[PDB]
Structure formats: structure tokens, C-alpha cells
Design a protein around this ligand. Structure first.
Ligand SMILES: CC(C)CCC[C@@H](C)[C@H]1CC[C@H]2[C@@H]3CC=C4C[C@@H](OC(=O)CCC(=O)O)CC[C@]4(C)[C@H]3CC[C@]12C
Ligand SMILES: CC(C)CCC[C@@H](C)[C@H]1CC[C@H]2[C@@H]3CC=C4C[C@@H](OC(=O)CCC(=O)O)CC[C@]4(C)[C@H]3CC[C@]12C
Ligand SMILES: CCCCCCCCCC(=O)N(CCO)C[C@@H](O)[C@@H](O)[C@@H](O)[C@@H](O)CO
Ligand SMILES: CCCCCCCCCC(=O)N(CCO)C[C@@H](O)[C@@H](O)[C@@H](O)[C@@H](O)CO
Ligand SMILES: c1cc(N2CCNCC2)c2cc[nH]c2c1
Ligand code: NA
Length: 287
């Protein structure tokens, strides 16, 4: 009964998790292979898209598999070091993602308001430095506090979990909860929204065919930004609400919002099918 039920559950979740992993990895490798093999998709903006696809790829190859083994098997099987490395990679990927989205918004703002200054200022070498900087800053605010144990609580519940090698709950003190949320998420969220609204306004104040084609690409970028926020904002809101009251949102919806967050990593490849050029590159590559 209990043994038959767990065998049905384990088998069915293991399949669902495989499918998620496959969709994230196939979809983002396509985005990277498309850009890497299509001279027409090799715009500076798409270098940032590639960076974003790497963040999602790392979620597919490392973050989600590990998290699946946890959801499926009902414990952490890989020891305390890997538990921390895994959390680190989790925080890294969300941080790098939202920071990259921020850079993309800024890139477009400059492109739209000062096309000429942009032309000369913005080159491939600089696009690469920009990308490395975002990963540097993300690595900095992700790994270091986590390997320093700045996130740990002394709660009775927190201390239980820390000793137990089967527990890889990211149970953190309130300071870290607020600090890391603000630094990894909310600040770059606010920047991205502010700059995105400015790019909207500038698009509205803006031959005719070329403008509708540009605008369609902008709206694509708008969509990946909006979906990212929808996918992660709930998690991070619940993260703050927990600091003030552990009992206002049930654990299950906190775990739900966590997976909704991971689910975002499978979405961009699909959204990029709004572009003829991406669509054609995807069809050619799947051969
Ligand atoms: C285990 C964790 C820490 C993974 C860390 C991975 C990063 C080091 C990856 C993520 C995004 C990658 C970047 C994504 C995009 C580019 C653009 C790329 O420009 C190109 O020359 C190729 C495209 C072209 O110009 O045709 C140079 C590599 C670079 C900076 C990559 C360098 C390595 C990065 C930062
Ligand atoms: C590094 C740059 C980009 C960010 C600059 C923002 C900081 C100057 C400020 C803005 C809000 C401040 C935070 C506001 C609230 C908190 C929660 C605060 O309260 C507690 O956690 C004590 C509660 C408890 O331990 O029970 C800990 C400091 C912290 C993170 C503050 C740290 C300093 C912050 C991040
Ligand atoms: C998260 C990895 C952190 C990535 C850190 C990259 C910083 C180094 C970049 C660099 O020195 N060149 C590019 C040259
Ligand atoms: C990038 C974010 C960096 C977060 C900075 C965290 C430092 C504050 C840590 C701290 O105050 N404690 C954990 C440090 O050991 C102890 C208390 O929180 C205690 O009541 C539980
Ligand atoms: C970035 C990503 C975070 N995560 C998002 C996905 N689940 C793991 C944790 C947290 C959690 C607390 N602070 C965070 C900062
Ligand atoms: Na533990």
C-alpha cells in the first residue's frame, strides 16, 4: 500500500522531472546553437541572450537534476558539500539571469535613444566584458556568503537540518533572507522595470515595416522579462513574508513557487519562436 504508492509516485515524478530537464536542456542548447551558427542572429543583443541561455542551461544540467533527486527520493543523497554547492549554483543562476535581463533592457534603451552613440560605444569586446562582469558580480553575491555560512540560523529547526546529512533545506536567518533577496533579486528587478518602461515610452514616441519588425523584437524581450518576473516574484515575495510570519503562506505553495521559478528556464526558447529567424534556425538544426 505505502510501498506500492511510493513506487507509483517515484516512477511518475522521475518521468516528469526527466521531461522538464529535457525541455530546459534541448530548448537552450537550441538557442545557443542557433545564435552560434546563424550570422544573422549574431547581434550584440543576442550575446546577452546566449548568456541568459547559459544560466538556464546550468539550471537544466545541475540545479534541477539535483532538486529532482530530492523531490523524488525524499532525501538529499549527495552529502553536505554538494548540498551547499547546489544551493550556490541555484542562487547564482537567478542572480545572473535577472542581472543579464537588466543589461538587455539597458542595451535596448541606449540603442533606441542614441542609435549612433550606441553604434560606436558598443562593440563585441565590450559585450563580452559586460557579460563577464555580470557573472563576476553574481558569483560574488552568491558563492561567498553561502560558503561563509552567513545564511545560517540558530533556530531549533534550522540546527536539526544542518546536522542531518539528508536535509538540504535552504533554511536561512532573516538577515540573509532580506539581504540576499534585495541584492540578488529586488534591486535588479526594480532597475529592469524602470528601464523597460522607459524603453516602452521611447518606442511609443517612435521605413514603417522596419519599425514594426524592431517593435516585435522589443516586445519579445518584453515578454521574457515579464514572464521571468511572474515566475520568480511569487517565490521572492513569499521569502520576505516568511521573515515576518512563518504561518501566512503554506509550505506547499512556497515549494510550488520554487519550481515555478525553475520552470522559467524552459520558457525562453519557446518564446523566441516568435522570431522567424529563430524558428528557421531551430527547424534547420533539428534537421
Ligand atoms: C558552474 C558555473 C559557475 C558555470 C559558469 C559559466 C559561465 C562562466 C558562462 C555563463 C555565460 C557564459 C558567456 C555567455 C556568452 C559569451 C559570449 C561569447 O562571444 C563569442 O565569442 C561567441 C559568439 C560569437 O561572437 O559568435 C564569449 C563567451 C561568453 C562571454 C561566455 C563566457 C562564459 C559564461 C560567462
Ligand atoms: C550592496 C548594495 C547594492 C545594496 C545597498 C542596500 C543597503 C544599503 C540596505 C538597503 C536595505 C538594507 C536592509 C534592510 C533590512 C535588513 C534586515 C535586517 O534585520 C534583521 O535581519 C534582524 C532580524 C533578526 O535577525 O531577527 C538585517 C539587515 C538588512 C538586510 C539591511 C541591510 C542593508 C540594506 C540591504
Ligand atoms: C560565476 C563565474 C564568474 C566569472 C568571472 C569572469 C571574470 C573574468 C573575466 C576576464 O578576466 N576576462 C574576460 C578577460
Ligand atoms: C549577501 C547577503 C549577506 C548576508 C549577511 C549576513 C550576516 C548577518 C548574519 C547574522 O546576523 N547571523 C548569521 C551569521 O552567522 C546571526 C543571526 O542572524 C542569528 O540570530 C541567527
Ligand atoms: C536567490 C535565489 C534563491 N533561491 C531561489 C530558488 N530556490 C533556492 C533559493 C534564494 C533563496 C534565498 N535567497 C535567495 C536568493
Ligand atoms: Na543538512
Amino acid at each position: 500500500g505505502a510501498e506500492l504508492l511510493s513506487q507509483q509516485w517515484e516512477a511518475g515524478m522521475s518521468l516528469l522531472m526527466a521531461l522538464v530537464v529535457l525541455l530546459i536542456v534541448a530548448g537552450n542548447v537550441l538557442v545557443i546553437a542557433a545564435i552560434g551558427s546563424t550570422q544573422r542572429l549574431q547581434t550584440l543583443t543576442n550575446l546577452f541572450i546566449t548568456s541568459l541561455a547559459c544560466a538556464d542551461l546550468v539550471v537544466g544540467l545541475l540545479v534541477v537534476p539535483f532538486g529532482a533527486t530530492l523531490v523524488v527520493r525524499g532525501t538529499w543523497l549527495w552529502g553536505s558539500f554538494l548540498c551547499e554547492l547546489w544551493t550556490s549554483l541555484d542562487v547564482l543562476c537567478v542572480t545572473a539571469s535577472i542581472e543579464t535581463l537588466c543589461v538587455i533592457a539597458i542595451d535596448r534603451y541606449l540603442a533606441i535613444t542614441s542609435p549612433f552613440r550606441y553604434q560606436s560605444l558598443m562593440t563585441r569586446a565590450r559585450a563580452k566584458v559586460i557579460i563577464c562582469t555580470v557573472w563576476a558580480i553574481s558569483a560574488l553575491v552568491s558563492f561567498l556568503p553561502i560558503m561563509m555560512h552567513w545564511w545560517r540560523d540558530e533556530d531549533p529547526q534550522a540546527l536539526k537540518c544542518y546536522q542531518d546529512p539528508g536535509c538540504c533545506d535552504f533554511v536561512t536567518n532573516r538577515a540573509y533572507a532580506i539581504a540576499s533577496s534585495i541584492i540578488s533579486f529586488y534591486i535588479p528587478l526594480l532597475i529592469m522595470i524602470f528601464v523597460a518602461l522607459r524603453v516602452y515610452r521611447e518606442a511609443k514616441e517612435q521605413s514603417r515595416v522596419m519599425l514594426m519588425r524592431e517593435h516585435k523584437a522589443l516586445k519579445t524581450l518584453g515578454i521574457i522579462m515579464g514572464v521571468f518576473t511572474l515566475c520568480w516574484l511569487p517565490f521572492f515575495l513569499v521569502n520576505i513574508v516568511n521573515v515576518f510570519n512563518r504561518d501566512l503562506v503554506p509550505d506547499w505553495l512556497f515549494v510550488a513557487f520554487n519550481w515555478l521559478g525553475y520552470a522559467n528556464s524552459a520558457m525562453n526558447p519557446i518564446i523566441y519562436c516568435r522570431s522567424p529567424d529563430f524558428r528557421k534556425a531551430f527547424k534547420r538544426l533539428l534537421a
